[PDB]
Symmetry: C3
Amino acid sequence: HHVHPLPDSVPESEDLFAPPPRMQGKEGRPKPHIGPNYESYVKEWAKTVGPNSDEWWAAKARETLDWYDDFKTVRAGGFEHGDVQWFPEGTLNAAYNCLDRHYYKNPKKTAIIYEADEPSESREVSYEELMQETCRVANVLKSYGVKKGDAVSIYLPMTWQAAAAFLACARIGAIHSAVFAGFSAESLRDRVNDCECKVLITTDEGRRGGKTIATKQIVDAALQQCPLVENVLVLRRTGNKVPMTEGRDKWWDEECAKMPAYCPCERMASEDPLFILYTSGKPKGVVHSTAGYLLGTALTLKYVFDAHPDDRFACMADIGWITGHSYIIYGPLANGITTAVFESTPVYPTPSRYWDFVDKWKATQLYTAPTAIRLLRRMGEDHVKNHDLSSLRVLGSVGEPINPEAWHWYNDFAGKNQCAIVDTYWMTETGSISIAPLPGAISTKPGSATFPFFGMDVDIIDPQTGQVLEGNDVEGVLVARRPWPSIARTVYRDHKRYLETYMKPYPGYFFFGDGAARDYDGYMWIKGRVDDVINVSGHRLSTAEVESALILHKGVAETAVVGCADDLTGQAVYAFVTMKPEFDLKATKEADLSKELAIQVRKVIGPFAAPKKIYLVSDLPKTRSGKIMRRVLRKIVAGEGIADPQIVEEVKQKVT
Amino acid sequence: HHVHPLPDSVPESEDLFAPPPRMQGKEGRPKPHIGPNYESYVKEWAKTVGPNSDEWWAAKARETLDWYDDFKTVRAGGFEHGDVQWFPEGTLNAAYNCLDRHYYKNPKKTAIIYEADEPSESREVSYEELMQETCRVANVLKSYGVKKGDAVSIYLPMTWQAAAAFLACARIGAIHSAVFAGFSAESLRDRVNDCECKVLITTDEGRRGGKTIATKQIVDAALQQCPLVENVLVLRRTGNKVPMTEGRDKWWDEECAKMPAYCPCERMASEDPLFILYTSGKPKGVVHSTAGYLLGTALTLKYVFDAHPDDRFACMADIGWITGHSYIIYGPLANGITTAVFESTPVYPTPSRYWDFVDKWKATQLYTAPTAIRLLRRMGEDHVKNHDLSSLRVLGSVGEPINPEAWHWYNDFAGKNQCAIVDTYWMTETGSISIAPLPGAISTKPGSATFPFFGMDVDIIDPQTGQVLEGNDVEGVLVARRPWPSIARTVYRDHKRYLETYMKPYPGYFFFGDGAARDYDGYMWIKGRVDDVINVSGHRLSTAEVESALILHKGVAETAVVGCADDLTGQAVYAFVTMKPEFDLKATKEADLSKELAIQVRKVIGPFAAPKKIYLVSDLPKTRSGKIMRRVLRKIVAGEGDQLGDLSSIADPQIVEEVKQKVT
Amino acid sequence: HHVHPLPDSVPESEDLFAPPPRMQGKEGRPKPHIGPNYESYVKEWAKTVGPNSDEWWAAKARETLDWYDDFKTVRAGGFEHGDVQWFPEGTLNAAYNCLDRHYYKNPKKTAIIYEADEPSESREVSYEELMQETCRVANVLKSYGVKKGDAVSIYLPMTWQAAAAFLACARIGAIHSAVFAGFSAESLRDRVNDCECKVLITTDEGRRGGKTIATKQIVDAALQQCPLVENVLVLRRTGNKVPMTEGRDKWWDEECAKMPAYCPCERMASEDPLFILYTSGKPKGVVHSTAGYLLGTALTLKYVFDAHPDDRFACMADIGWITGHSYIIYGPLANGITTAVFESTPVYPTPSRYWDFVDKWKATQLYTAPTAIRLLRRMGEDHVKNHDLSSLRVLGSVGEPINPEAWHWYNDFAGKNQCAIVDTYWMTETGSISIAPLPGAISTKPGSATFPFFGMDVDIIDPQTGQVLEGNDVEGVLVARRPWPSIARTVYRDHKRYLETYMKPYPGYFFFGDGAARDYDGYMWIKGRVDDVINVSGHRLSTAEVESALILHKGVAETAVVGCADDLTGQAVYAFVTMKPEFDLKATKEADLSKELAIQVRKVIGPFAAPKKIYLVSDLPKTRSGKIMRRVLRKIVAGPQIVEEVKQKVT
Ligand SMILES: Nc1ncnc2c1ncn2[C@@H]1O[C@H](COP(=O)(O)OC2CC2)[C@@H](O)[C@H]1O
Ligand SMILES: Nc1ncnc2c1ncn2[C@@H]1O[C@H](COP(=O)(O)OC2CC2)[C@@H](O)[C@H]1O
């Protein structure tokens, strides 16, 4: 076979992990909605794609959501000009489907488990409390003149009120634009100005990992260049002395005390914009409609994680990420279950924090990024070994390919080999999970996204010819043939960039921008960004298979390989390797470590995949979501031309 | 028994007035919807409360109102945090339920009987005319940029166009804030600024009691401190020269002439705010939603007054009062009947005006306040005795406890002992009538509100312990157990004050602020405000029983007793008595009359209730709705005159100076 | 008989044209919705009028349109106070019924045949393309802050994007106010200021008949006196170097490139205003609601022209005219057929342009004005004789009474005596066609509108007594007894003028302002405006019969007769006659020609109708819609370059 699984230390015959007993309906656990085998997944999946799927999507839309006005058409439009339409005639409100309809049925059921930065301050927020807080904020926004269609910037840390600020905007038909708390004043400025918002919601200070986020300090600097912002709502999170501008700035609690605890729901057309979300050139504000996005997040959350009514979904991401949008707030609350708002880091107070949380609340699912798993892997298994963690049934990975080493560490310790691992592939532009194994039906492989989700008709294209590589054992670029409900509708006031980025390069398709491969079993392998691909002497090297090989060597915590122009091979491979903090870098020779890694790569991939130069760095350039910034490293090693900015100075200094 | 009826001259066994013949389906009168006995009221009432009442309330809302979008949930929310919800998902429009759907069935039926200040200028306003006037005003407001959710101030006298200005706001989804015509410039300013309205509706002048109300003069003075008001629509009521500011002020007739006579109805969510109404500390803007309030006003009117399609309802109150909101405009027009807009006073041209009106239009119900009833008692029965008044079937009282003396004068002369008397207890914050006898089912008692209305689950609480006084013959503070559709939703931009006033003092309940008593027959007695109670040597005195005792003495027209701290008795009783203007002044010594009143109180209540000092004054401090301002007298008779409020919009503000001068 | 047909050279017994074979269901043509005789038209019409007609109107509204929310009441209000209501409770969107529901059914079906000024640049615009363009413009408007109820001025030539600009406004609930491209800056200014619009849509330049319309040049002059206009969207139609005002003016293509190709449809109540249209004293902004107007245009287009799904409707009018509003955009697109946007004149490149167009696209109906018919009649029959034109089934005339001479030229050459001729009478204030023959059921007469459309119960009133002239063979002023769905709802911010013009003069009726006559056959004859009537010695002379008489004399191309105060006859007749440019007036003495025309009128009408003085002019004062401006001539004999010529001759 030509397409090979990501390098792993386990033999392939022992590397097929079928759904465990917890995902089989045993141990008193809920039977999965999809099961018990791969055919059972395809039987349902094939109903959701092709030109005969309209009846299926219409039925699901009416089952999943509560509509004020029914729709007549199911789908319309296409990629060509960016006129995607789903359920155009229907009306609904997101805050109603995420709050009201569950409050009316069981008001005391916990909507949010608020895990505070300090574990002792954690508490449960019922649907009643969240609904009342949401309605108060909505009335405050109306009193500020916020109208349906106006943009509202949210600059909030991971306190539970962030969901109230999200859903308050959705309740009145406003368009919220959430920005990671802790972004620089310049980054926040650009996103406030691009959405042309007149109202901004923030805190006095944020608390993550025992560190203070000077939110109001940053907002003041940014708004010195944001003339359109007239009202700033400041949530009193810490109570520390922070500057306040009289007239413009008002306290969250004081404003909400003047407002009623109920607010009517604005009846939104399906294609009314629900939110703007800028991704970390110019800031790209991905715009999502209402009904399609909500339906997508609801069904993926229900099917990709096998959600059941009493479950407690624990997504540890930040709401500044689409993962937080879709699988902390909208997805979980749409289905009417409990969701987790994690305010701290995975290592505060100690690297046992994740597992202290899981056993404290009896979390039934855990959702996080590969970068977090690698962080916990390099801290020691003592922090996980002595935990129960039996409430869990599904563990999810999102943001990047998951190295088989991290995959196993996730599977072995967090799941105790009794949880299904769902490597969920998707994008901010996809709205909901696009490719992931259904935990109760699909047998997994370390690092494989497996098979596409409902409504996702994906294929592999030759990047040069542009034609479909039919069959298995093929490698190329991933594309989608048909629109899906939760697909992004535009880029805010830059629809030209929306079409040129995803619709022009391969006409007739959606262009994810990812290299993909379909091995001989039909499993989809998403091996990294197309821009990250390295072509050594006519050999397409993907960063996932190379980095997966490097982590197989003892002591390695994280790696990142980029491409640079080479005299002989056209393009050569350069590697950045982060060793575990408890490595004896003095005992193992630096040059010897490079040779050991080089031979390691040669053994599992091929002679061509060996790095030509290796760089030792304390950490890698990373976004706030956890993605490795390979483009940044690539330009640095080329001479032409976000979590910890100090890594940039270290990388360029080590370049010489 | 411990709980005793309000002082009356009739024994209790001869003081129970069963439903009269007119309310029995006889004398060619419509058979009541509820009857014939008390059991028939309980059988239906029990469907409206308890955990099985959604089935009843859902049916009534859908049968009573026309909805643009149906609702899914019946009720939700509660008192605790002030998130009351009724029919959340439904959409509707008030102006549609009060105008359009009746215009479509019989456009020529009289919607408003306009009783002008001068009787000769009275005329009938059909539903067609009222709808066209409303749609024109709505289009004028739309042309001013008024959007759904915007506030509009109404400063209009009791001319028939006032209903058009109300329903025009409701038609476009705006929130009208009506202020009594004649309020001082300072009082109007504060209410115009508090609702943050940008448009003001007013007249050039108002006409009541043959005197000119310089409305536009007052509006001009107030608007120098109301910067948010950009457009003022002036109704030409008298036509006298009044200042007009070009651009800001434009004439009603001219503006409406540029607009079509139909306007689309904004589809309002059930919980969208319908109106703000400031009640006479800081101005308290009581906010009401749409569907709950509309349903409440409609059902109370249909059941408390036994409304039938052809009836002609005559509420003489002013639209600046919640009684006018609910039982002049919204209540009556929703039910599709005729309602009265009375522009004059009860004594202009003469104290026979009320009864001339009833016999001219053949009014079938009359609704007014005790202050007006006592006033007519004090003018002479020659002005009422020689009237027919046989069209009437139900007489209503609202605003304060009804004195057994006034109740009888109401029953004897206005009704000729052939009308059922409905003592309707409620508040601006309740939206619709809370406690009242159903005329065709309940036998009344002088001064008793009798039994609570549908959807009202009320109880008696000990004000200290906070526990329910179960059973009969109990006395305490009135509370409600469950929300009711028409309950106020908030105080405009002061939801904290809303919760602290009605929801915090007795958590889990609504606190009316009224002392109440449930006698041994189950009848409820609302004996006055809790703030007005006087505790003489640990004995709780309610202002109703004391003033009812005083009114039992011949010659008494009106009284008002307040409390003052006493060294020995803790609190002592002080009385303010307004005797008829033609009493034996100078002939009967002031000191001689004071002793007679004190002994009368000692004879019917007890020695502790005897006033220690009595003050004779020409009138009492009163609001424009007719409530006696006992807080003013209490603070004045306690040396707190410097700490009084904005007593400028009082019915007669000069009476305040008389009380403080009469300090000794 | 007292009521006589308009002067024609054909005998009356040879002047009744029954539905031709193409309109009878033969030759592979669709069965007409109404047929085959007059009784079939009356049988259906009686359901649409009277106090039991709600059942019919409810069914049509629900079958014809797609509603977001259903209605309960059918009709309400009346003429008295101007509170007409139709389907008050229902919601819908015009852009949805004209674009979305057809895009969802067949996106590639051609919505607009765009006939460019140069024939070689013509192309088909599919429903998909038109919908995408509309949604982009709608999103551009929303980004400008345009809200439901805001007015938007449209100053666009006859390029296909004009429909996109119309429907974009309708999509978001805005009220579009279209103004003829080429109107002076003063006329544009007055109409822009009266609607208080915040946004204006125009082109850099327009092209009609090979000439440049400096649209943006005119806009600049007008906006120097239009304070409320903040944003101007300029469509690059020609691309010529034109001034642009930074900030205020932005390009259509550039703005639309920033927007998605879909936009949600605003859910409009039936009586929400759809558009303002000023008619060419002070400018009169006629306002139309949504559901009534849309339903009216749909049914008249379906029945007056016997529209069928695959038909290709060719209305050559301009969208600045109500004919363009109702029977270029709304009518056809609502019914989901193909419509024509004709950008040129009927004589560019040659007077065969109309007929070259018909055979190129195989148009199934043609709709135009008498002013266009008369122009081509005087250009030579060689340009029409040698064309196929067999795709046509119905030819329509609109704007003014159709002279029997032009009527025959229409039927003889353009129709080849195989098309039904529909003389459609209505006004901007009626919304849709009021009186017209149903082509598959009614036998026509040259110059007669025949019978009123469904829902139109019209009558004749004696202009003096004010009483109804019941029966046939009656002549007077035309009025309507009951409101009809598409009736105009008001005049923008002048409901007083609206009531005084149409509702006050004859209370209880709608006053069209036209002299009318109902002959012994029940046929209705619209003989001209009441203001144009001439009372010679107590004889009511209508301009149609007098001008029809003048056109019966050979060499006459167009005429216009006005009234004059006379000492003896009370009112005297003055005639303005336009002879063909290739007439040798130098050979024929002026006085000789006048006597021949004067006697001609004496022969066909009577001695009293003879003009007292006849004036020879190259052309007549005309609007852009084609109506003859008789008021101009009337005051001229008392105390666009044609005005200078007319005043000099009478001296
Ligand atoms: N399961 C996965 N396997 C391999 N690669 C993955 C996977 N999930 C994400 N990615 C990478 O992250 C981008 C998305 O990031 P984004 O923040 O836009 O959306 C985030 C996902 C919510 C993908 O385009 C790709 O490059
Ligand atoms: N039948 C009654 N018996 C005894 N007291 C009554 C009665 N009606 C009103 N009140 C007093 O008036 C306040 C409300 O006045 P408001 O103007 O807000 O509402 C007015 C009533 C529409 C009550 O709280 C109470 O103190």
